[PDB]
Structure 1
Amino acid sequence: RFLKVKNWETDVVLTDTLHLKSTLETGCTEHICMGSIMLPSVATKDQLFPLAKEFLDQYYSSIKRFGSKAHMDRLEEVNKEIESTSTYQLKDTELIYGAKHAWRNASRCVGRIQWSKLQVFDARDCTTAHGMFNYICNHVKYATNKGNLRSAITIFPQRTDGKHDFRVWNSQLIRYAGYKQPDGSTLGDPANVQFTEICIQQGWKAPRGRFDVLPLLLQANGNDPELFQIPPELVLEVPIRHPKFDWFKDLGLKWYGLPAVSNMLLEIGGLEFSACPFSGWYMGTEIGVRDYCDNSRYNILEEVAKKMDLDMRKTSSLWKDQALVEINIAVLYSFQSDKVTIVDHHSATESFIKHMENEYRCRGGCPADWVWIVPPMSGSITPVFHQEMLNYRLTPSFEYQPDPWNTHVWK
């Protein structure tokens, strides 16, 4: 009931009591653990008020005014709004608190040490696709800060009935296109081959190359979505070069600077924000391991091994491992030499351990998903590999949601 997590590299123990405030369900049972399943699985006023009260009770507890008259009046004020309107509206302060704690509670995020320095852009007055584009352009420009990347979120109107949803149909604001070929192979990013098609079905004219930035597909208030091109001056890109291998430039790789997730749902006080793009900075391995070396993404270990003059016959020559490291030295060096913010999996995992220590002290724990927190290379020479972690669902939270093209009434 008051569980213990141990670190097996330092023999450090921490006691978790925050998991008592956990609410949602994990997918695991007493007889089965699903902690490696990727996606485990209209709101009414009956459910809304307990969720609002639970959220408000922790908000007012956070500003040192638990249960005061200002608290009780806001509780009644919201209770009466849910009675009248069958929903309610967050104060700006509550919105910023809510957003910051959805990040704080993101168990799959290794970067949460930064959770309190989030810039929240309130876009709940938006009504059109064009307004979303404008709001999203300002988000991009701010978060990029000329390479001095700053974390931020832009929050579009909450879900009302269900058929009037604000949605960014892109999974990230900046992604490269994926084109299949007549010979079956893929140009660009295979991940986005389907979304790259949908843009064309809606009228996008593709430059059909490698690193072609996709347009935005913005759906406002349930209406059919619309295409907008992000001004290229707003899309910062880093060309990937190596500090030793000069042939690495001829690989002609590059990546975008701003990681900005746009397909998730923000839950605050039982209110659902279906469009809530949020951005930080990359850990190098996201690019240099997954984006570049997944078999089903850019898949470059092939060429990189070739140019290094590697034994590619035997699997046991570790030619894949050796080329994977060079690629990540180059992603980091390129970003740093350009002064674009990035963190290596060593610094980032060390910071999460120190974050964890801060959380258990001043909060009673920190939900953490080991499967996602451990980096995709060199796992056990980073400190989080040896750190036991308890995973549980706290609110406010970011949640997955269906891709909007599978659920949307059209025209």
Structure 2
Amino acid sequence: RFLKVKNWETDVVLTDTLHLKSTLETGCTEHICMGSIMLPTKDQLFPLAKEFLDQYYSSIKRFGSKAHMDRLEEVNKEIESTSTYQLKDTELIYGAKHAWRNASRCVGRIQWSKLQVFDARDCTTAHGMFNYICNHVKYATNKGNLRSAITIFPQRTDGKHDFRVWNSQLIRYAGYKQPDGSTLGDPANVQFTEICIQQGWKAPRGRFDVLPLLLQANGNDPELFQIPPELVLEVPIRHPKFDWFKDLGLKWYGLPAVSNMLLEIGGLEFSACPFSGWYMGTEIGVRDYCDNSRYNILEEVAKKMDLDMRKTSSLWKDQALVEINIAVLYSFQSDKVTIVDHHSATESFIKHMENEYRCRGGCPADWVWIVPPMSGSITPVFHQEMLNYRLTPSFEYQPDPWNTHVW
């Protein structure tokens, strides 16, 4: 019932107790492990509320104080009456920060407590959403000195009146059908680019066209807005050694900002809660550039390096992959946009695991996502046993809204 995790590199052994407060389910059973699958009202609300406020009041050293008991009654009175309730600012800040703290797939969690929270619960329209978002993007960007932040739109009610950002990130490039049978821009975004075009966007049809935000307020049809160009910090990609690199025409954006998830605090669901921090290099260099189903550029790069592409065993793919990632890091650093490499990121996450075992009794971690998609075994996370379990407050996936919302 107490569980040991060992690090096979350093022999350090940790004891996890935090898992016993695990609440949600994993997908695994004693018969079958699903570790590698990408996705495995009135009655229920008060339990969820209570469990949250309990951890809250414990966290501020007020467990069992009168202020504690009073809030618990206040919230119960509100639910019995209004079939829902509202969070205090202090509660909301703590909930958001803890959803980040509990994100088992996030390597960057040493930072969890430095999160600027923007309370946008007073928002009512899609134009209001847009204003909030622009302010978030500008505050977060900070002329290259990136700062973590999240913006929280009003919470779900009867699920007939959801707030949703339709984009998956705030900033993403378009992807287009061609007669060629090929793909122009980012293939990740084809379908969404077409929901744009069909809702009205005039697509410039380039390789790196910044997508229009698509915002939905109080369950209404969504509306299109272009983030001001001057707010979208982008980075031209060059290599510190190869002068030809820049002729590939590569650029990436500086701000990673996931916008499609759902934040759950104390039973309440926040369906629009865009959040953002800063990139680990490999997310752009390995995934964005080199995945077959993305910009898929290895072939073009290797050629320019004049490597022997005759046999997989010359490791030309691997050689080209390292250079691309060297070019990503170098470009962001030279333009002074914040970025972290995988060595530094993982080394920080291991220090953060230790702190969290020391100070909280554990740290939920999904090894499959924490280990970088290149050079796994030379980073320390590789040798570290991890335990994966679901705690609340949390971020969760939710179905794409187009499939769902009635048009």
| TM superposition score normalised by structure 1 | 0.99
CA distance in 1, matches of 2:51, 2:115: 23
SS of 1:222's partner is: coil
SS in 2 for 1:304: helix
User: Displacement of 1:62 after TM fit?
Assistant: 0.5
CA RMSD in angstroms, aligned pairs only? 0.4
Q: Equivalents in 1 of 2:53, 2:374: separation in Å? A: 41
Q: Confirm whether residue 24 of structure 1 aligns to residue 24 of structure 2.
A: yes
Partner deviation per Cα, 1:348-389 (whole Å, 9 max, x = no partner): 000000000000000000000000000000000000000000
In the TM superposition, residue 205 of structure 1 has moved relative to its aligned partner by 0.2
Partner of 2:343: 346
C-alpha displacement at 1:313, in angstroms?
1.1
In structure 1, what is the equivalent of residue 50 of structure 2?
A: 53
CA–CA distance in 1 between the matches of 2:242 and 2:230?
30
Q: Give SS of 1:198's match.
A: helix
Q: 1:236: Cα distance to partner?
A: 0.1
TM-fit CA distance, 1:222: 0.4
Shift of residue 395, structure 1, vs aligned partner: 0.4
Q: Distance in 1 between matches of 2:152 and 2:363?
A: 25
Instruction: For residue 163 of structure 1, report the CA deviation from its aligned partner.
Output: 1.0
Alpha-carbon separation, structure 2, partners of 1:409 and 1:297: 30
In the alignment, the residues of structure 1 paired with residue 375 and residue 184 of structure 2 have an alpha-carbon distance, to the nearest angstrom, of: 29
1:100-120, Cα deviation, whole Å (9 max, x unpaired)? 000000000000000000000
1:282-311 deviations in whole A, cap 9, x for unaligned? Answer: 000000000000000000001100000011
2:219 equivalent to 1:222: yes
Say if 2:397 is the partner of 1:396: no
For 1:393 and 1:344, how far apart are their aligned partners in 2? 27
What SS is found at the alignment partner of 1:4? strand
**What CA distance in whole angstroms lies between the structure 1 residues aligned with 2:136 and 2:216?**
17
Aligned-pair CA distance for 1:199 = 0.2
1:45 CA drift (Å) = 1.5
Q: SS state of the match for residue 129, structure 2?
A: helix
Say yes or no: does 1:191 pair with 2:195: no
Cα distance per residue 1:149-177 (max 9 Å; x no partner): 00000000000001100000000000000
Residue 35 of structure 1: aligned partner: 35
| 3-state SS of paired residue (1:343) | coil
1:67 deviates by 1.2
Cα offset for 1:138? 0.2
The answer for the alignment partner of 2:9 in structure 1 is 9
CA displacement at 1:245 relative to structure 2: 0.3
Choose the corresponding residue for 1:265, options 247, 262, 265. 262
SS at match of 2:346: helix
Structure 2: distance between partners of 1:76 and 1:128: 33
> Shift in Å at residue 178 of structure 1?
0.4
- Aligned equivalents of 1:403, 1:261: Cα separation in 2: 13
| Separation (CA, whole Å) in 1 of partners of 2:312 and 2:384 | 31
Q: Report the CA distance between 1:211 and its aligned residue.
A: 0.7
* Superposition deviation, residue 224 in structure 1: 0.2
SS class of match (2:73):
helix
In structure 2, which of residues 97, 109, 113 is the aligned counterpart of residue 112 of structure 1? 109
Q: How many residues align?
A: 407
2:15 partner SS: strand
- What displacement does 1:239 show? 0.6
Give distance in 2, aligned partners of 1:6 and 1:176: 41
Deviation at residue 5 of structure 1 after TM alignment: 0.3
Among 203, 207, 210, the alignment partner of 2:207 is 210
Q: Distance in 1 between matches of 2:293 and 2:164?
A: 27
Distance 1:335 1:96 in 2: 30
Deviation at 1:392, TM superposition (A): 0.2
2:184 and 2:64 map into 1 onto residues whose CA distance is 58
CA distance in 2, matches of 1:113, 1:408: 37
Inter-partner Cα distance in structure 1 for 2:267 and 2:237: 43
Q: Distance in 2 between matches of 1:310 and 1:193?
A: 32
1:282 alignment partner, SS class: coil
Distance of 2:63 and 2:177 partners within structure 1:
57
Q: Distance in 2 between matches of 1:307 and 1:60?
A: 60
Q: Which deviations, in whole Å up to 9, do the C-alpha atoms of 1:64-96 show, x marking residues without a partner?
A: 111100000000000000010010000000000
Aligned match of 1:74: 71
Q: CA deviation at 1:180?
A: 1.9
State the Cα distance separating 1:183 from its structure 2 match.
1.2
Aligned-residue offset at 1:184:
1.1
Structure 2 residue aligned with 1:241: 238
Q: Is the partner of 2:27 in helix, strand or coil?
A: coil
State TM-score, norm by structure 2: 1.00
Deviation at 1:213, TM superposition (A): 0.3
Deviation of residue 28 (structure 1)? 0.2
CA offsets per residue over residues 242-264 of structure 1, 9 Å max, x none?
A: 00000001011010000000000
Q: Could you list the per-position Cα deviations for residues 179-229 of structure 1 after superposition, in whole angstroms to 9, with x for gaps in the alignment?
A: 121011001000000000000000000010011000000000000000000
Give unmatched runs, 5+ long, in structure 1. Answer: none
Distance across 2 between alignment mates of 1:408 and 1:312: 48
Unaligned runs of 5+ in 2: none
